[PDB]
Design a binder for this molecule. Structure first.
Ligand SMILES: Nc1ncnc2c1ncn2[C@@H]1O[C@H](COP(=O)(O)OP(=O)(O)OP(=O)(O)O)[C@@H](O)[C@H]1O
Ligand SMILES: Nc1ncnc2c1ncn2[C@@H]1O[C@H](COP(=O)(O)OP(=O)(O)OP(=O)(O)O)[C@@H](O)[C@H]1O
Ligand SMILES: Nc1ncnc2c1ncn2[C@@H]1O[C@H](COP(=O)(O)OP(=O)(O)OP(=O)(O)O)[C@@H](O)[C@H]1O
Ligand SMILES: Nc1ncnc2c1ncn2[C@@H]1O[C@H](COP(=O)(O)OP(=O)(O)OP(=O)(O)O)[C@@H](O)[C@H]1O
Ligand SMILES: Nc1ncnc2c1ncn2[C@@H]1O[C@H](COP(=O)(O)OP(=O)(O)OP(=O)(O)O)[C@@H](O)[C@H]1O
Ligand SMILES: Nc1ncnc2c1ncn2[C@@H]1O[C@H](COP(=O)(O)OP(=O)(O)OP(=O)(O)O)[C@@H](O)[C@H]1O
Ligand code: MOO
Ligand code: MOO
Ligand code: MOO
Ligand SMILES: [Mg+2]
Ligand SMILES: [Mg+2]
Ligand SMILES: [Mg+2]
Lengths: 244, 268, 268, 244, 268, 244
């Protein structure tokens, strides 16, 4: 299998809908990230959240194809990244652009303890067709990067405890059961909504390094800290990479 | 359906929600460059062969853009294979190899673009900067590097570290997302055969075939990157492609004129 | 005055020196794009409304560029308001919000530009790259994001962290610095009223008004960003603007034809 | 009021006309900056000086509008920044471009003790009309940045002791009286030349953090060092931000 | 010779190998923009003089591009000399001064480009982005900064830190590498004289001279950067240059019409 | 003479043909570079190697001029740099682009112990005419940079022991005698192939700081380490800069 480029790296994906909650969610998360900086070397990647739904609304009404919508959504994840990095600027943290993440991440993590980037991948107008919604979104881009780097982990920071058998905020809310642990292949065989991109499950199937990804509730202070130490506080997704 | 129901789902569901996915599928379908044809000029099959292959195709491009809007993407070829071999032997991942391959397609676009510069045809990033060139009779064509922009976010193949989405896929996805009328792959064989015509004696020419038929015949990874055939079945706008021999003088011109040279591969 | 005296002052005084300032004011006045019209397409008022608003304006732009050179800037709209609300609640400063808002105007320019791409009309940075498009009958128009480039150097408002110079100001300043002949703001109301027509019952339409009259009537921050009215009184080249309803079919076309639709706001 | 993004930052603006004096002024200033690097975290921003007057001469003769002249002047401040950074390169100091200053300053000041940038703001062809001379120049851009960041200070390094009641090098030189301290509002009510942009006074009126800016003579070694420690060695400009 | 032998040498020898060098010299010779003329507009000699010099040349450029494809490069002039003096006094190396000088040529290109924008003529990086402009009768010209891109990799002169390759060299090398038909240096003297006509009383005009003759006459570093004369003797495509007085109305126009105004300097 | 911008810098040029040997050569070199990071501040610049020969083959067949071939070859050196930097990423090493090397090298070497860049200079379509092969290649660009910076040294890492009197892999292999030491002027007066650009000798003649450049065999572990300590393990090229 490929070498690990940055084996000491921890990648943390912050859901766009967590950022959407504003200061009430962001300020505790920023304080927790602050305390984590001396403990881990962090690549912090932000998702897009509700503003990408709005630009999808407009773009789909205009008839635009999925490759047009992909960079429009990615923009929102970048904006979330700029916001989060600004809150950590006094700790030496800045937002870095995609080409910088791709080619210069090692030097930037040597300069400072953490950087922030967009979790969306730069598929741009080369997004895959099929769905009118861009498939390769924030979870997927963050995993692709974390696995490409051979990072020590990817933790997905959600606005819910983890993955349930139904949308815990949706119409079937009542029968939604929490899943402490699952495999990507099991999730891929299920129909129904998930808190993670369906394409995340696909890229987990071809993964080379990351064995497990934990989805944890960023609205509960301490869960991200526990997850980065491997404590089981959300849903563990086994990727199907086997350990030695 | 309705815009109001779609916007309701967009606000309140995960994008993974099947109900949202279905409502989004009913959206109107805008073609951005409906009158353009995307042409891929093979790296190994054409540009690596130098003048004897490239100069006649330059002439055809110049003649063709008189009546056809052209988006001309370049393949990568042997220097990318060399980089892939070095990097793969080091254990580097597909995402690193993807960036290496892009630089070779860029080189090829630069060489082709310099032969076309006096005819007014620029080298551009992609179709998103082709608007002005494609509106001018004096121009009506652009050249671009055919590699997708995925770089370190390249999805790996099931096995090995060779990027599975290379310049066939890059050009196809551009034709698809810009809603172009036609996708022509310019290679160094007359089209698809039942076996590799270079290494097989009595391979039989196939003028027309569907993706499903190709898979059933063992041709999944033959004259196009196999991911392209799957992309083609998913495509909204480009539901067939044509593969032609760029080494035959006039083959591209005749394909642009609607002649069934080469092989037509259909999504269904 | 004389060039020699101006150059003397330029070398020997602070640029703050009133004598230098006055000599510089006597310099000749070159208009860079004197025949172009700048049009701002509202983000909240037009593009956020989707196809029913945008498609008719696309048609008008395509028809209009046959006889008019157009610089078409986009507003930002509701996604920028959302970003401003998140960032303001975090205590972030106006300079940070300014960068956030620019990304939303960029999105809108990209969407509009993709609808215009097949008509030859590109998305550009600003007026400094419009030279070739505006010389071609086949093109004669460009699309740009309307947000000024101030980013972290945005001057804050007297109160609050909302950037005071947004896309009305960005488009106006472009028309002004390029010496364009006309500035048209395309919104979702027929023009200026004596009160907000959305929240007031019996607001009265105002066909023509000066900035001073607007301020005296309490309309300083009504249908345009208030900083724009001050910029307008300072302007050298664009001394009036026209506000029109982009939701009325043909309103932009008629405004380009010299019809007094909407409201004309004059510097004096 | 807005949070302070980089509360530990010290911003130092070097007048273009100081740089114009060449090695005789620059070498002592470079040695003083060298000794300051272990004491402060510095954003060093350069003004434009005489070359911008020349390009104004040409551009105004050509009739060009104020938005054309603004980036032409900013170029000169950038050149001064490249020169000054080259002199500090052996200390790890480099020039950083405007987008880098805007979005990645925190990581760059984590990598090294100081960076150099252009003091001009990127108003470009969106400079305000009215005067034919670009109003938002080096003092103004440096203050906008320092206040946006919530920096601990902005020190303006001049070729004179500070602000006088008349140009101390001009026709009314004889009646020029030194002002040890003034307010921006008092300066704004006066007509006559200043060593600082008039627009600096305007942006001081809307400032959120910086309470005072000292203008000191960079031709006197030690004054910048003293000013960064709050010693009163030039003209203090009170912005009208009140302390707690 | 043969392609096969050339490729053999290319694979198996150092590029320093005389046998490889000789085989490469037999390669075919493609001219990228064979019909274009490169014009250098002097920084100190023209643009620094402001309107009286620049405005008539703008008119000529606009008239000339009706019948001539033009690549118009700008010199740097007195602000670059000022930067060179500051930096040289600090002990900075030629590579640092090279970047400083480029910014001044960029300023001059921006000023000239803004006077030409309404005529459709853009400011571009160099000849590699001129393809579309030079194919359009409405355009047919571009403006570029004349400084070479060497930056910190500038080769120093034998003595001193002034970059030896400045905007004369930058423009010449562009004409040469794009295989342009003509290179015109627009300065502020009628051409070459036997001595500096500004500081010599009875200097004699030289209508035509070779590089060798210039060197033998002590004119190696006179009206062109001396490195340019050596580049000219090495050139494959541009084997002579013409130096004309841009301050004489119509001189550029007449030079483009084939009139022997000014001085023709020949490689041999 | 000009000041030394980065007097503590060591520049190491890795031959493209060394990289062409793949893992068998690269992995030992990477391990040696790893051990050097705590000892030196390194700018590691890669040459182009065989792929540039291929693109020369194509471009010359197409008739393209030398200014067209120069950036085509430089691309290959950049690719080699990206490969080598990826192997050192876990040590904090990244590839940096030419404008970054030109203007921001000091800050990047403050962030991390080494960076990698392309050894080719950005002559682009302004390459000099005369030969149909771009003259200013990897050795030349690396020397120009090292001397411009006033670096403590430039070490050229070759696939042979150093310079011989004939190509030690060519037709006159049999009479090839090793040269432990030579001057650039002596090499320039000789006809025949060299392992270094002929233009390297020209830029050595105008050099201001670098007095000697050692060409050493990167296929022999330890020679680069010894060379960076000034031990004589390959061919020393005296530039003709005199010591004080
Ligand atoms: N099976 C499920 N288990 C848990 N949550 C689900 C499930 N199906 C749908 N959801 C919904 O997904 C929501 C999270 O939305 P989403 O994943 O789009 O936000 P995000 O990850 O913050 O956004 P982005 O992908 O832009 O970063 C949850 O609050 C929940 O309502
Ligand atoms: N069944 C088949 N029919 C036709 N060609 C086949 C078949 N199987 C394999 N091939 C091979 O596919 C090749 C075309 O792929 P190749 O990678 O050379 O094209 P390319 O587009 O030039 O690639 P790149 O642009 O990535 O260099 C043909 O040369 C042919 O040898
Ligand atoms: N006196 C008035 N007359 C007319 N319109 C008014 C008045 N006062 C307030 N308005 C409001 O101003 C609005 C136009 O501003 P709005 O911000 O919607 O335009 P916009 O250019 O689309 O903004 P952006 O482009 O920043 O989204 C109108 O919808 C109207 O409700
Ligand atoms: N009231 C005043 N007090 C002090 N100096 C003044 C006053 N009015 C004018 N000046 C002049 O301003 C000069 C400084 O010029 P200026 O402020 O333009 O240079 P700078 O700040 O170095 O340039 P830049 O703004 O490009 O950084 C002083 O040397 C002095 O002659
Ligand atoms: N023998 C000579 N004949 C003609 N001109 C000469 C001679 N010797 C010196 N010169 C000088 O060369 C000058 C032209 O060079 P100059 O650097 O001014 O041109 P430029 O292209 O404007 O430079 P830049 O563009 O770098 O500012 C003339 O003004 C002239 O004084
Ligand atoms: N006089 C000589 N002494 C030593 N080697 C020579 C000589 N002449 C030719 N060579 C050849 O040069 C080869 C090295 O080739 P070259 O210098 O092109 O590679 P490189 O330096 O790795 O490439 P790049 O310049 O792209 O970095 C040696 O292996 C040797 O065969
Ligand atoms: O984006 Mo950065 O911080 O040195 O390359
Ligand atoms: O300009 Mo930098 O030094 O890593 O982004
Ligand atoms: O390329 Mo960078 O400038 O690592 O901070
Ligand atoms: Mg989610
Ligand atoms: Mg001042
Ligand atoms: Mg070598």
């Amino acid at each position: 299998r490929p070498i690990r480029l940055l084996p000491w790296l921890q990648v943390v994906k912050i859901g766009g809908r967590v950022m959407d909650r504003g200061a009430d969610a962001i300020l505790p998360l920023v304080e927790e990230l602050r305390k984590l900086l001396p403990e881990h070397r962090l690549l912090i990647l932000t998702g897009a959240g509700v503003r990408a739904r709005h630009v999808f609304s407009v773009g789909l009404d205009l008839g635009l194809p999925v490759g047009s919508l992909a960079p429009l959504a990615a923009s929102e994840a970048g904006q979330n990244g700029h916001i989060l990095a600004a809150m950590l600027a006094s700790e030496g943290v800045s937002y870095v652009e995609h080409p910088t993440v791709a080619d210069q991440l090692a030097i930037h993590l040597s300069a400072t303890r953490a950087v922030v980037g967009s979790a969306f991948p730069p598929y741009h107008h080369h997004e895959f067709p099929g769905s009118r919604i861009p498939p390769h979104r924030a979870d997927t881009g963050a995993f692709l990067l974390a696995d490409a780097f051979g990072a020590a982990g990817l933790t997905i920071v959600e606005n819910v405890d983890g993955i349930y058998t139904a949308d815990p905020n949706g119409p079937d809310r009542g029968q939604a059961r929490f899943l402490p642990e699952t495999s990507a292949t099991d999730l891929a065989k299920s129909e129904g909504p998930l808190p993670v991109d369906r394409a995340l499950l696909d890229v987990m199937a071809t993964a080379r390094h990351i064995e497990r990804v934990q989805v944890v509730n960023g609205l509960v202070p301490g869960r991200l800290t526990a997850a980065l130490r491997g404590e089981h506080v959300g849903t563990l997704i086994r990727t199907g990479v086997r350990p030695a | 359906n309705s815009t109001a129901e779609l916007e309701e789902l967009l606000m309140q569901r995960s994008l993974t929600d099947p109900q949202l996915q279905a409502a989004a599928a009913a959206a109107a379908d805008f073609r951005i460059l409906p009158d353009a044809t995307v042409i891929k000029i093979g790296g190994q099959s054409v540009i690596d062969r130098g003048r004897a292959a490239v100069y006649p195709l330059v002439d055809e491009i110049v003649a063709a853009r008189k009546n056809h809007k052209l988006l001309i993407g370049t393949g990568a070829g042997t220097r990318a294979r060399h980089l892939y071999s070095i990097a793969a032997g080091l254990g580097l991942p597909a995402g690193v190899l993807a960036q290496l391959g892009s630089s070779v397609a860029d080189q090829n676009a630069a060489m082709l673009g310099q032969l076309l510069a006096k005819h007014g045809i620029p080298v551009v990033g992609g179709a998103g900067h082709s608007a002005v060139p494609l509106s001018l009779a004096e121009v009506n064509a652009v050249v671009f590097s055919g590699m997708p922009p995925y770089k370190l976010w390249m999805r790996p193949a099931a096995e090995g570290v060779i990027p599975p989405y290379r310049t066939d896929a890059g050009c196809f996805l551009l034709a698809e997302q810009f809603g172009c009328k036609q996708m022509i792959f310019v290679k160094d064989e007359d089209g698809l055969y039942t076996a590799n015509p270079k290494t097989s004696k009595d391979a039989t020419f196939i003028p027309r075939i569907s993706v499903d038929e190709m898979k059933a015949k063992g041709l999944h990874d033959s004259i196009l990157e196999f991911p392209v055939l799957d992309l083609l079945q998913s495509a909204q706008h480009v539901r067939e492609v044509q593969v032609v021999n760029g080494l035959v003088p006039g083959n591209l011109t005749r394909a642009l004129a609607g002649e069934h040279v080469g092989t037509i591969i259909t999504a269904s």
